[PDB]
Amino acid sequence: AWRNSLSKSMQELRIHLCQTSAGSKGVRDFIVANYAEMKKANPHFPILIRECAGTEASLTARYDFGAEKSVNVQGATTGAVQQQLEQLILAGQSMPKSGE
Amino acid sequence: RGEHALRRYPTGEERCIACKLCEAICPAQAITIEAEEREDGSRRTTRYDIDMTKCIYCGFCQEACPVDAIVEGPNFEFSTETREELLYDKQKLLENGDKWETEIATNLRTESLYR
Amino acid sequence: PPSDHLEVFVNEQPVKIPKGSSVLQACDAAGIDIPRFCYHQRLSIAGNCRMCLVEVEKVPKPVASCAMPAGPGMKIKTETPMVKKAREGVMEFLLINHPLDCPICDQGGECDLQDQAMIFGSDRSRFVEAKRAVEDKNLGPLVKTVMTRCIQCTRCVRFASEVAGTAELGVTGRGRDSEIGTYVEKLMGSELSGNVVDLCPVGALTSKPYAFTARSWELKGTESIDVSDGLGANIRVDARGTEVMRILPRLNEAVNEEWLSDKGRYQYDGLKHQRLDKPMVKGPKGLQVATWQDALGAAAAALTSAAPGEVRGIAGKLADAESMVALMDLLRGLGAGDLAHEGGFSDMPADVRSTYTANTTVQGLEQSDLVLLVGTNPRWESPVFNARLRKMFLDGTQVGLVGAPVDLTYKYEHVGSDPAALAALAAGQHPFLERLKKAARPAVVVGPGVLRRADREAVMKAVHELCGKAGVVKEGWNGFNVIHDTASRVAALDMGFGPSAAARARRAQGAQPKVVYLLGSDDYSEEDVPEGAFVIYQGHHGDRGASRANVVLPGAAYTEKSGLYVNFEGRVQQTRAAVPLVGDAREDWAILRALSEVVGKRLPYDSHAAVRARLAGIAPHFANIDAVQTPVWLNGEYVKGVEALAKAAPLQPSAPLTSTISNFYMTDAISRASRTMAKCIQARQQTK
Amino acid sequence: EFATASADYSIAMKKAAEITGAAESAMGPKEGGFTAGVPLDTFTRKARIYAPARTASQSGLARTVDFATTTPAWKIEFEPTAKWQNPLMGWTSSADPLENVGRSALVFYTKEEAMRFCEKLGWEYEVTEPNKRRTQRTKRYMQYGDNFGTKRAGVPDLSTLPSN
Amino acid sequence: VVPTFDWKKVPVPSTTAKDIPVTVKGATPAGDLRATSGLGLGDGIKNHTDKWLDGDKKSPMEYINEVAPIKVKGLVVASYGSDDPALGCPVEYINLKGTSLENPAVCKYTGNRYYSDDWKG
Amino acid sequence: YSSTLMTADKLGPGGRSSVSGITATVFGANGFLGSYIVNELAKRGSQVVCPFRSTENEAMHLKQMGDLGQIVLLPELDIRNDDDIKRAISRSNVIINCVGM
Ligand SMILES: NC(=O)C1=CN([C@@H]2O[C@H](COP(=O)(O)OP(=O)(O)OC[C@H]3O[C@@H](n4cnc5c(N)ncnc54)[C@H](OP(=O)(O)O)[C@@H]3O)[C@@H](O)[C@H]2O)C=CC1
Ligand code: SF4
Ligand code: SF4
Ligand code: SF4
Ligand code: SF4
Ligand code: FES
CA of D83 to the centre of ligand 3 (A): 26
Of all residues in chain D, what percent are helix, strand and coil, respectively (each to 5)? 25, 15, 65
Q: Is the CB of B57 under 6 A from ligand 3?
A: yes
The Cα E42–Cα C243 span in angstroms is 13
Residues 2-21 of F with CB under 8 A from B: none
Which residue has the CA at smallest separation from atom 4 of ligand 5? Answer: C156
Q: What are phi and psi of C541, to 5 degrees?
A: -140, 135
Q: How many CB atoms lie within 10 A of CB F68?
A: 15
C213 and chain B: CB distance < 8 Å anywhere?
A: yes
| Collapsed DSSP state (helix, strand, coil) of residue C446 | strand
Alpha carbon of C243 to those of C247, C275, D83, E37: distances in Å? 12, 13, 11, 9
B39 annotated among ligand-binding-site residues: no
> Using a CB-CB distance cutoff of 8 angstroms, which residues of chain B are in contact with residue F68?
83-84, 87
Alpha carbon of D93 to those of C577, D81, F17, F89: distances in Å? 18, 11, 7, 27
Q: How far is E76 from chain C (nearest CA, A)?
A: 7
F31 annotated among ligand-binding-site residues: no
Name, in order, each residue with C-beta under 8 angstroms of C644's C-beta and a sequence gap of 6 or more.
Answer: A40, A43
> Using a CB-CB distance cutoff of 8 angstroms, which residues of chain B are in contact with residue E91?
none
Beta strand extents in C19-112 (DSSP E only): 53-56, 63-64, 75-77
Q: Where is B96: in which H helix or E strand?
A: helix B90-111
Q: How many CB atoms lie within 10 A of CB A56?
A: 16
Q: Is the dihedral of CA C148, C41, C625, C619 positive or negative?
A: positive
Closest by CA to B87, choosing from B45, B34, B30, B23, is B30
B19–C212 CB contact, under 8 Å: no
Name, in order, each residue with C-beta under 8 angstroms of B75's C-beta and a sequence gap of 6 or more.
Answer: B2, B3, B5, B96, B100
Q: Where is C281: in which H helix or E strand?
A: strand C280-282
The Cα F27–Cα C403 span in angstroms is 77
Q: Where is C275: in which H helix or E strand?
A: none
**Helix ranges restricted to H, F1-101:** 4-7, 32-43, 56-63, 82-88
The Cα D52–Cα D43 span in angstroms is 23
Alpha carbon of E58 to those of B96, D96, E50, E51: distances in Å? 16, 43, 12, 15
Question: CA nearest F63 in B: which residue?
Answer: B82
Q: What are phi and psi of C247, to 5 degrees?
A: -130, 130
Q: How many CB pairs under 8 A join B and C?
A: 23
- Residues forming beta bridges with residue C541, ordered by sequence position: C275
The Cα C390–Cα C387 span in angstroms is 5
B111 and chain E: CB distance < 8 Å anywhere?
A: no
Calculated CA dihedral for residues C479, C484, C485, C490, nearest 10 degrees = -140
The Cα C328–Cα C330 span in angstroms is 5
| H, E, C per residue of C655-680 | CCCCCCCCCCCCCCHHHHHCHHHHHH
* Pocket (CB within 6 angstroms of ligand 2): B 16-22, 64-65, 67, 69-70
Q: Is the CB of C113 under 6 A from ligand 4?
A: yes
Tell me A22's DSSP state: G
Q: Is the CB of C101 under 6 A from ligand 4?
A: yes
CA of B19 to the centre of ligand 2 (A): 5
The Cα C215–Cα B17 span in angstroms is 13
Tell me C545's DSSP state: H
The Cα C368–Cα C399 span in angstroms is 10
Euclidean distance between the first and the last CA atom of chain B, given in angstroms as a whole number: 14
F32 annotated among ligand-binding-site residues: yes
C215–B24 CB contact, under 8 Å: yes
**Helix ranges restricted to H, A1-100:** 2-5, 25-40, 78-92
| Collapsed DSSP state (helix, strand, coil) of residue A84 | helix
Of the candidates C132, C133, C209, the beta carbon closest to that of E35 is on: C209
Residues 618-637 of C with CB under 8 A from D: 625-626
The Cα C181–Cα C147 span in angstroms is 9
By the 8 A CB rule, do C233 and C255 touch? Answer: yes
Give CA A46 to chain center in angstroms: 10
Question: CA nearest D140 in C: which residue?
Answer: C395
Q: What are phi and psi of F39, to 5 degrees?
A: -60, -30
F69–D88 CB contact, under 8 Å: yes
Q: Is the CB of C139 under 6 A from ligand 5?
A: no
Q: How many CB atoms lie within 10 A of CB D125?
A: 17
Name, in order, each residue with C-beta under 8 angstroms of A96's C-beta and a sequence gap of 6 or more.
Answer: A63, A64, A65, A67
By the 8 A CB rule, do E90 and E109 touch? Answer: yes
Of all residues in chain E, what percent are helix, strand and coil, respectively (each to 5)? 15, 10, 75
E35 and chain B: CB distance < 8 Å anywhere?
A: yes
**Is B106 exposed, middle or buried, given 0-12, 13-18 or 19+ CB atoms closer than 10 A?**
exposed
Alpha carbon of C667 to those of A95, C228, C677, D164: distances in Å? 44, 8, 11, 57
Q: How many CA atoms lie within 13 A of D14 on its CB side?
A: 10
Which partners does chain B have (≥3 C-beta pairs < 8 Å)? C, D, E, F
Q: Is the CB of B21 under 6 A from ligand 3?
A: no
Q: How far is C104 from chain B (nearest CA, A)?
A: 6
Number of H helices, E strands in chain F: 4, 4
Maximum distance among all Cα pairs of chain F, rounded to whole angstroms: 40
- Residues forming beta bridges with residue F19, ordered by sequence position: F11
CA of F88 to the centre of ligand 4 (A): 54
Calculated CA dihedral for residues C609, C612, C614, C617, nearest 10 degrees = -120
- Residues forming beta bridges with residue C566, ordered by sequence position: C572
By the 8 A CB rule, do D114 and D106 touch? Answer: yes
What is the per-residue burial (b if ≥16 Cβ within 10 Å, else e) of D69-82? eeeebbbbbbebee
B16 annotated among ligand-binding-site residues: yes
Note the resolution in Å, 1 decimal. Answer: 5.4
